[PDB]
Structures are given as structure tokens and as C-alpha cells.
Design a protein around this ligand. Structure first.
Ligand SMILES: NC[C@H](O)c1ccc(O)cc1
Lengths: 177, 230, 271, 329, 49
């Protein structure tokens, strides 16, 4: 049983490494991206990235034909849905929102909504009231876990929203809401 | 892969000396290691062994109180310390790697070796020299005091044929299997108490001295030997 | 008459305590899906309260049923030490759970990197070591009581009653109730105000917080009030509401947890 | 449109009677306990798939963790741990020779790992690509040939050493989610969104047979050990089984109690036991002849990701979504 | 898509009764040896506990 003992010891070493990697993994607080966005992340091929802010780690999952691999993304802290509303395609984004809501496996995974590329809207263009009206249309569609709308630094917004999501989840676990 | 051993020399008895092993070519952190010394006119003898994380460390029962062994993974070097040596420890040493998992091949590579000058399980290699002719099967037999068959169904026996002039090589592991860089001619067989190794076709490279080895027990005594003549 | 009623109620309390704690321990051991570092506090709290039920309430119930203390005086000192040790362990254990929730709510984003297995082990060791230090040393050494009560015991050794002196009283009260009580009133109040703010911004925390805190405070306060106020049949009551708290602890602190609620349902089905 | 009409008329004219009438007179199996005999823990996320080796002792499992690990099932020891570069692998494999492992998924690239290296540390033997969609299954055809099924409505055969795909298969219209190959390694079937299970010949290189008995999508498939039939599971809670020579559907193991889809299916060595896995926190076990449930396999709390029998049928391993492998018997 | 129809027409389909008979015959023939159909004794079971 000598070789068996040595194999057990090697398995214990591998388990120690697994424990260390678990300690690393539990402090990641991964995020999903859905749907400009390149400027947000920087400041087909998945551009998974690691970025640390305020000594807190974050894992971004950069990602059109709808498939089942969305279901496997069950344990994401938040899903950031980006939308450059320069316009048809907006209705396609609303359809994707409805599919996300009705996926039945993305439930209890909060979705943040971003209305970015305000400069493009301004150049395309009260006009501010008109853009607020189209935004309100987007929320009205979004009425069909909780969503976090956002309209204008974005990293601070996602920091606060992730903090709120985790706080609400942990409050739910202990029956305080 | 490469193992380089440094140290040795001639030192009067009752002294101390450090030997070093530099490993280059593989991730030897997850590699158990052994030291095996050989007298100029005798067979190989076990010295000590260290695990992958240097957690479990065993020693030779004959000499345990005057030996030290350790390893440094970032320094890529595993070393041994000899103190209060005697005339018996006039032998040339070997540095051996080994990995332990289901399907592994321990004692895969043997180091070049460096020189130095100044009952439990035993085996029986009664035969010493059996010259043979080309195109004829050659059989070498070995025996054990205690049956080497375990409850798992695998017999822990090894063969360590050594070419005349270089380090020993691994041929047969676990009494049935075959190592990586070995011709298919070599084949192990037996029943569980008497073991044998047979070669169908013989060539110049087949000339050497064949050693049998046990592993049920970590003291790891290994057998005495047999010359091959052509 | 009344004696059998008191005996049956007391053994009912004892049996409820042991049953609940052992059920919690067996469920967490067998399920293996609740071996997270967070639940270790609950598990070892169940262990400490099991020790409470096995050691302290047995002696207290026997001495209430019989009256005569049918043991040696060293056994009485050991019983008092066990009382103090395991009650302080349970209270400090509640304190550790409260601190855990405070770090899990107030600063949730950096929570997983500030409460690891190392930190859980450190806090558990600190609680157990502090409880042992306050309990075992003074009673066996002899500083737990004054010389006047030493002569009191010397006079008639038939019965023994647990009383202390000024320094032991203040030290035991401080390390047993007051600091954990302040930890409660700070951390649980903060988590309650956070929950209230979140609920009002959403456009049930009161009931949960009130039950969890008020149960412990109501069952532990009068005993230490008697203790500290009058260092200078009621005592049996106060002791037994303390042990009543002991009985309720692993039901209250497991029923309100969704995962532990599911584990409780699974264990009940296993019966 | 007339050609398909006459094809379907000929297909419906070649069926005389079903096997349900000829099966009701046979002895059934009663009940099987199938209690857990071993458990495997050490993962940190949801296992997505697993595949026993040809020796029925070692197994390999990958999860969302980002590492695929190889267990010695007899003693729960971790033989190997492979730190995958990408965290999104949706499949596994274990070569019949026992030397290579396979992985793939959202990374769009298949990775072949060489276990028996000169050193004790594994490495990517071949990172091979050529697919525009996520990989579903990457079963090992042989030592240097591997069959893969990607979400681009086509499935490929890859030569390991060269890298380029020797043969393509573009007969589908939807994305193949599940690929299985016969034990003889001469044919292989797959299923996609269009609810059409297609049977392919490896040497021919283009679709040999088609089956359209389902409605939603063929989300899981497996082969009969005899080699003349295969059973599949869909989102319609249906376990429809098809033959090969007849080209017609045989019988359906459908129960109205289940409304969700299926995760995976698998047979036994004899073939008169068709295990299956559902989303309702259970693993129903059918009987491939009487179509009647003969027991349950409920020891998990999440979706049962992948359940598979061994080559010799001594055990079944059900890697679940709760970071646990369970080896029944 | 015409080739698909042509090959389906020329597929030479066989009756289902023969396939069902082959299936049940193979299932009955190879049923004694495999586990998972009848509880196995601990002697032959590799993982006894
Ligand atoms: N459990 C009541 C017991 O008498 C007791 C008294 C004082 C303490 O600090 C702790 C415990």
C-alpha cells in the first residue's frame, strides 16, 4: 500500500491547491456582458478580463443567434446589458431583454441596463425630454430579482450596483426583506 | 530531462559532505525523489526518499541517524547531507525521480551519478552469468521472501537492467507492464512468488546486468544481480 | 402532584435541547452541502449547546428534583465551571454570528475576502479560549469565592450554592454578557437600519430582528441583573430561563435560514 | 414538394405493427434500488460533462471552475488536475487508448491534452480550430482522429496531428447540441434545433439517414450498445428511440408528469435499461422494452448535468450542477 | 436538396418487425452478465462500500 499512500498524499496536495484556488475564486464576483461597450470594458471571441477596483476583484465576460449556453451562466453576480440606441434594432434589443426575462434560468440574477453613447445621440439630435421619453419607453418594455437602469465613471456605477445586489441577496438569505 | 549530481571526493572517516542534485527539463516539484548508492563491487542500495511536497520522508533502516536529506523547488535542487561516515559508505550515488498515481511509472529516470570514496524482505538472484547465442530466448529469474501480491491485484516488482558503463534503466514496472522507451522484446512473467524476465531477440545493447526490485515495503530493498554475456 | 409536572417539564426542556442540537449536527454532517465557513459558527454553537444540555442541565435538574446534592464538592465546583464555560461559549458564539452577519451585510462586496476559513477558526478559537480562561481557572484555583463563603461551605458541606466575589462578579459579567450584548446592540441595529433603508427604497426585517435579539436579551438579562445587582427559589428560575434560551438557540438560529430550513425538512423526512 | 410526399408515403407504408403488442407478454424487471456507492467532491462549480475511460476506472470531469480533473473512481483520488485556460468548457472526452483528453465550448477552439508526457505535467497537445460555433460534443474516434459537433449547423472530423478537418458534415439546418458515435466507430448520430436526428457514415462524409419524430429539439442522444438503434431526449420530456434498418420510430418513453426537457440519456451493457436525466431534480430510469418506470435516482439538489454508464456496466456516474459527482451501482 | 430526396427514396427501408425482434433478442441474450439489472454480490463488486 506504499504506492497507494503516495497517491493519497499527491491527491491531498492537489486538494490543497484546489482549496487555494477556491479561496481565490470566491473573491472574484464575476459579471456578464450582453449586447460603446468597448470603451467601458477597456477603461465570436470572448474577451474575459480581470480588473480590480478598491481592492475588490471583478471578472468580466465579454460576449447574434440565441442559443442555450445562456442557461449555464447561472451564478453571475450581474448582467450588464449595453445598448447604443442610435436608431428596429432597438426592438431586437427589447426582444433579447424579453428572452432573458423568460429564460426561466436567469431568474434571481440581476440585470443592469446601460444607456451609453450619449454623444452619438446628441450628434444625431425638449430634445433631452425626447431622449428621456425613449428611455422611459425602454423601462416600460423592461417591466415585462430586480433590474438596475442607468443613464448618464461607469465602473463606479457597476461597483455600487454590485454592492447593492449582493447586499439584497444576503439580506434575502437571512429573511430581512 | 536531466539530473546532474555534484559533490563527493576522498575524505577521511568521521567527516561530513553535501551532495546536490540539479534537475532540469521537467516540473520536479510534483516528483518524489530517491537516493540510491552502489558500492564499487556490490549492487544498488537504498538510502532515502522524499515526497512531492517533502511531507512524508522515510529513511534506510541501516543508516538513519547520520543522514539528512532535503529539497528546494524554487532553487531547483535536492540535496543530501552525510555526517560521521564510515568505510562502508565508500560508494557512488544515484539520484532517482518517481511519480505516484494510478498508471504511473516510478523510477522513470536515473541520474548520471557522482562518486565518493575515503529479517525484512530480501531477494535471491542466484544466477550470475548465463551467456547466450543470437536468436534465442533469454530468461532471468528472481525471487522474494514474501509474496509481493497485494489486495489490489497488482504485484509491485520492478526490473532495473543497467548497461555496463552508464546509469541503470527502468524496463519492467509492476511485474507485468513495460516502460516508455523499451523494445517489445523484454517481457515480465511469473506467478507471484518467483518472477522472470524474458527477451526474444538479443542485440549488443541488450548486454547488461539485470536487477530486481520490490516496493510493497518502503525500505525498498532491491536484489543482488546477473551478468549477460554474448 | 406538582413535582412530577416540574420534572416532566424540565426533562422536556432538556430533551428538546439535545434533540435540536444533535439534529442540527447530524444534518450538517450528512448533507455536506452546508459545510461553508459561514455555517461553522452554527454547527459549533450546536455542539456547545449540546455540551450545555449534557453536562449542566442534568446536574441542575437532578439537584432541583432531589434537593440534596448527591455528589462531592469537587463535582459541584466542576458543575459550576461547566455552567460558566459553556454559557459564555454560547453567548460569545452568538456574538461571532452577529459579527459575521454584520460583515456580510454592511460591506458585502469585500466580505468574501475578509471572512475566510482562517478568520472563522481564529474567532472560534478566541471565543472558546476566552470562555475556558474565565471559567476553569478561578473556580479550581480558589479565587472564584471569598473566604467568608469558604467558611460557609466548611460549616455544612451538604449543599452547595454558586456565589462569587467582587472581581469575579465583574469579570464574569463583562466577559459573559456585556461585551457580546453591546456587539448585538451595535451590529444587529446597523443591519436592521440597512434592511429598513433597502425596503423603503424598494417602493419584514423588524419582526426577524426583534425576535432574534429580544429572545436572547429577555432570557439572559434578568439572570445577570440579579447577579450584578446583588453581589452585595428565584435563582432556579433565572437559571432555567437561561437553559430555556439554550434549548431555543438551534431552532431559532436555523429555522430562519433558508438553506438550514431545507436541511431541517430533509432531516425530518429522514426520521 | 411531391418528392417528400411520396417519401413519407413510402415510409408510412413500410410499417405493419409496433413492438408494444409484442412486448407486453415479456417478463419485466420489477424495481432497482441503485443506491449511491461512491461520491466525488473537489469541484468548485457545476460539472458540465464527464466520460469514463475504456478501463471503467478513471473518469474526467470539467466544470465552470475553469479546470478539468481526472479521478480514479475506485478510491476517490484525484489522478490529475488540468487548469484550463478558458473557463467555458461544455464537454469532455477520454480517448479509448487512454492517453489524451479533450475539451471545448464557448472558446470556439477544441483542446487536446496529452496525459502521458515525458514530464509529470500535462500540456495542450493540440489546440485545433476551424469552427464558427460553440462545441457540443468532442467524442474521440481514435488515437489521432476526433469527431466534433459545433453550433454552426455542421459537424467535423479532425485529424489530430495535421489539424485540418479531413471531413465535414453540413447536412443539418440547426445547431447540433448532442453527438454520439457507435461502439464500432463506423457511424455516428446527432441532433439539433430542427428536431431531426441525423445518422452519418464516417467514410461517406455526408448524411446517411434522417429521423424527424420529435418536435422541439434533440438536446441529448446516445447509442444502443448493439449498434442498430439509438435513444434521444428532447425538450418535450420525450425519450423517443429509433432503429437503423427500419428507419422508423419504435416506441416512446413519454410521461405527462414531466414538462421540462432532458439533460442526458444512457443505456446499460445489456441494453434493457435506459437511464435518463431530467431537470426536476431526479434521474428517472426507464425500461427500453416495456416503457415503464422501474425506479428513481434522486440524490442531488440541482440539475443532473451528465450521467453515463461505464464500458463494462459496473457503475453509472451522474455529474450534477452542485459541484458533485455521484457513482451509483 | 434534391439529392437528399433521391437518397431517401433509394434508402431501401426495412420493416420494423425484424428490427424489433433483433432488439429484443439481443436484450434477452446479453442480460445475465451485465450488472444494474440484478443486485450484484459484494465479491464481484469493485467498490463494496
Ligand atoms: N448559565 C448560568 C451560569 O450560572 C453562569 C453564570 C455566570 C456566567 O458568566 C456564565 C454562566
Amino acid at each position: 500500500s506504499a504506492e497507494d499512500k503516495a497517491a493519497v498524499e499527491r491527491s491531498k496536495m492537489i486538494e490543497k491547491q484546489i482549496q487555494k484556488d477556491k479561496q481565490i475564486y470566491r473573491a472574484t464576483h464575476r459579471l456578464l456582458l450582453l449586447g460603446g461597450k468597448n470603451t467601458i470594458v477597456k477603461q465570436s471571441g470572448i474577451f474575459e478580463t480581470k480588473f480590480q477596483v478598491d481592492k475588490v476583484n471583478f471578472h468580466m465576460f465579454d460576449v447574434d443567434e440565441r442559443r442555450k449556453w445562456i442557461q449555464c451562466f447561472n451564478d453571475v453576480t450581474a448582467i450588464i446589458f449595453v445598448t447604443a440606441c442610435s436608431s428596429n434594432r432597438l426592438r431586437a434589443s427589447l426582444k433579447l431583454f424579453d428572452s432573458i426575462w423568460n429564460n426561466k434560468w436567469l431568474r434571481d440574477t440581476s440585470v443592469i441596463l446601460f444607456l451609453n453613447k450619449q454623444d452619438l445621440l446628441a450628434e444625431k439630435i425638449e430634445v433631452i425630454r425626447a431622449k428621456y421619453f425613449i428611455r422611459d419607453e425602454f423601462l416600460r418594455i423592461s417591466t415585462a430579482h430586480y433590474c438596475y437602469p442607468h443613464f448618464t465613471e461607469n465602473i463606479r456605477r457597476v461597483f455600487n450596483d454590485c454592492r447593492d445586489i449582493i447586499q439584497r441577496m444576503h439580506l434575502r438569505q437571512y429573511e430581512l426583506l | 530531462v536531466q539530473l546532474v549530481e555534484s559533490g563527493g571526493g576522498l575524505v577521511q572517516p568521521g567527516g561530513s559532505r553535501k551532495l546536490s542534485c540539479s534537475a532540469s527539463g521537467f516540473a520536479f516539484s510534483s516528483f518524489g525523489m530517491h537516493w540510491v548508492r552502489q558500492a564499487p563491487e556490490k549492487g544498488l542500495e537504498w538510502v532515502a526518499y522524499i515526497s512531492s511536497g517533502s511531507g512524508t520522508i522515510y529513511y534506510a533502516d541501516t543508516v538513519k541517524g547520520r543522514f539528512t536529506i532535503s529539497r528546494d523547488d524554487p532553487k531547483n535542487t535536492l540535496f543530501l547531507q552525510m555526517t560521521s561516515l564510515r568505510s562502508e559508505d565508500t560508494a557512488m550515488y544515484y539520484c532517482v525521480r518517481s511519480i505516484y498515481y494510478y498508471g504511473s511509472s516510478p523510477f522513470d529516470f536515473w541520474g548520471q551519478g557522482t562518486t565518493l570514496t575515503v529479517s525484512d524482505i530480501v531477494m535471491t538472484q542466484a544466477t550470475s552469468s548465463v551467456p547466450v547465442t543470437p536468436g534465442e530466448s533469454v530468461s532471468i529469474s528472481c525471487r522474494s521472501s514474501k509474496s509481493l501480491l497485494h489486495s489490489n491485484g497488482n504485484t509491485y516488482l520492478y526490473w532495473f537492467l543497467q548497461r555496463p558503463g552508464q546509469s541503470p534503466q527502468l524496463l519492467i514496472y509492476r511485474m507485468s507492464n513495460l516502460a516508455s522507451g523499451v523494445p517489445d522484446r523484454f517481457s515480465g512473467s511469473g506467478s507471484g512468488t518467483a518472477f522472470t524476465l524474458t527477451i526474444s531477440r538479443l542485440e549488443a545493447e541488450d548486454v547488461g546486468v539485470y536487477y530486481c526490485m520490490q516496493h510493497l515495503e518502503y525500505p525498498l530493498t532491491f536484489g543482488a544481480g546477473t551478468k549477460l554475456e554474448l | 402532584l406538582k413535582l412530577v409536572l416540574k420534572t416532566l417539564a424540565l426533562v422536556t426542556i432538556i430533551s428538546s435541547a439535545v434533540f435540536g442540537n444533535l439534529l442540527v449536527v447530524t444534518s450538517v454532517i450528512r448533507h455536506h452541502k452546508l459545510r461553508i465557513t459561514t455555517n461553522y459558527f452554527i454547527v459549533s454553537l450546536a455542539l456547545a449547546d449540546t455540551l450545555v444540555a449534557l453536562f449542566a442541565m442534568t446536574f441542575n435538574a437532578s439537584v432541583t428534583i432531589s434537593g440534596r446534592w448527591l455528589f462531592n464538592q469537587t463535582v459541584c465546583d466542576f458543575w459550576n465551571s461547566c455552567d460558566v464555560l459553556f454559557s459564555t461559549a454560547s453567548i460569545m458564539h452568538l456574538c461571532c454570528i452577529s459579527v459575521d452577519r454584520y460583515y456580510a451585510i454592511i460591506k458585502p462586496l469585500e466580505y468574501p475576502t475578509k471572512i475566510t476559513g482562517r478568520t472563522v477558526a481564529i474567532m472560534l478559537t478566541c471565543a472558546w479560549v476566552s470562555s475556558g480562561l474565565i471559567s476553569f481557572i478561578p473556580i479550581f484555583l480558589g479565587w472564584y469565592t471569598t473566604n467568608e463563603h469558604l467558611v460557609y461551605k466548611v460549616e455544612h458541606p451538604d449543599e452547595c450554592i454558586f456565589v462569587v466575589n467582587k472581581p469575579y462578579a465583574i469579570i464574569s459579567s463583562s466577559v459573559s454578557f456585556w461585551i457580546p450584548c453591546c456587539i448585538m446592540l451595535f451590529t444587529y441595529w446597523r443591519i436592521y437600519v440597512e434592511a429598513t433603508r433597502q425596503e423603503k427604497m424598494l417602493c419584514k426585517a423588524a419582526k426577524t430582528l426583534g425576535i432574534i435579539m429580544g429572545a436572547f436579551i429577555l432570557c439572559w438579562l434578568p439572570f445577570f441583573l440579579w447577579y450584578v445587582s446583588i453581589t452585595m427559589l428565584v435563582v432556579d428560575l433565572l437559571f432555567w430561563i437561561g437553559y430555556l434560551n439554550s434549548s431555543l438557540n438551534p431552532v431559532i438560529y436555523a429555522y430562519f435560514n433558508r438553506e438550514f430550513r431545507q436541511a431541517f425538512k430533509e432531516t425530518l423526512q429522514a426520521i | 414538394e411531391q418528392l417528400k410526399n411520396q417519401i413519407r408515403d413510402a415510409r408510412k407504408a413500410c410499417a405493419d405493427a409496433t413492438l408494444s403488442q409484442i412486448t407486453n407478454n415479456i417478463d419485466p424487471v420489477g424495481r432497482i434500488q441503485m443506491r449511491t456507492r461512491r461520491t466525488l467532491r473537489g469541484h468548485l462549480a457545476k460539472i458540465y460533462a464527464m466520460h469514463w475511460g475504456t478501463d471503467s476506472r478513471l473518469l474526467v470531469s470539467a466544470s465552470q471552475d475553469g479546470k478539468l480533473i481526472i479521478w480514479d473512481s475506485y478510491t476517490t483520488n484525484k489522478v490529475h488536475a488540468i487548469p484550463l485556460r478558458s473557463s467555458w468548457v461544455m464537454t469532455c472526452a477520454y480517448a479509448p487508448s487512454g492517453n489524451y483528453v479533450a475539451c471545448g465550448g464557448l472558446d470556439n477552439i477544441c483542446s487536446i491534452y496529452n496525459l502521458k508526457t515525458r514530464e509529470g505535467n500535462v500540456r495542450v497537445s493540440r489546440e485545433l480550430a476551424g469552427h464558427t460555433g460553440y462545441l457540443s460534443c468532442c467524442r474521440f474516434l481514435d488515437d489521432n482522429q476526433i469527431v466534433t459537433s459545433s453550433g454552426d449547423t455542421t459537424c467535423a472530423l479532425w485529424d489530430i496531428e495535421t489539424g485540418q478537418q479531413t471531413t465535414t458534415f453540413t447536412g443539418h439546418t440547426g445547431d447540433v447540441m448532442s453527438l454520439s458515435l457507435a461502439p464500432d466507430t463506423r457511424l455516428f448520430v446527432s441532433g439539433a434545433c430542427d428536431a431531426s436526428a441525423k445518422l452519418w457514415d464516417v467514410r461517406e462524409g455526408m448524411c446517411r439517414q434522417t429521423f424527424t419524430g420529435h418536435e422541439s429539439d434533440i438536446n441529448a442522444i446516445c447509442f444502443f450498445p448493439n449498434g442498430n438503434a439509438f435513444a434521444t431526449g428532447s425538450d418535450d420530456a420525450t425519450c423517443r428511440l429509433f432503429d437503423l434498418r427500419a428507419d422508423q420510430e419504435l416506441m416512446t418513453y413519454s410521461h405527462d408528469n414531466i414538462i421540462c426537457g432532458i439533460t442526458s440519456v444512457s443505456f446499460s451493457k445489456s441494453g434493457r435499461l435506459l437511464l435518463a436525466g431530467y431537470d426536476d431534480f431526479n434521474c428517472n430510469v426507464w425500461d427500453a422494452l416495456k416503457a415503464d418506470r422501474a425506479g428513481v435516482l434522486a440524490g442531488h439538489d440541482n440539475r443532473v448535468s451528465c450521467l453515463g454508464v461505464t464500458d463494462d456496466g459496473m457503475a453509472v456516474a451522474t455529474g450534477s450542477w452542485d459541484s458533485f459527482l455521484k457513482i451509483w451501482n | 436538396l434534391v439529392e437528399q430526396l433521391k437518397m431517401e427514396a433509394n434508402i431501401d427501408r426495412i420493416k420494423v418487425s425484424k428490427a424489433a425482434a433483433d432488439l429484443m433478442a439481443y436484450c434477452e441474450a446479453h442480460a445475465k452478465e451485465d450488472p444494474l439489472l440484478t443486485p450484484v454480490p459484494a465479491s464481484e463488486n469493485p467498490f463494496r462500500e
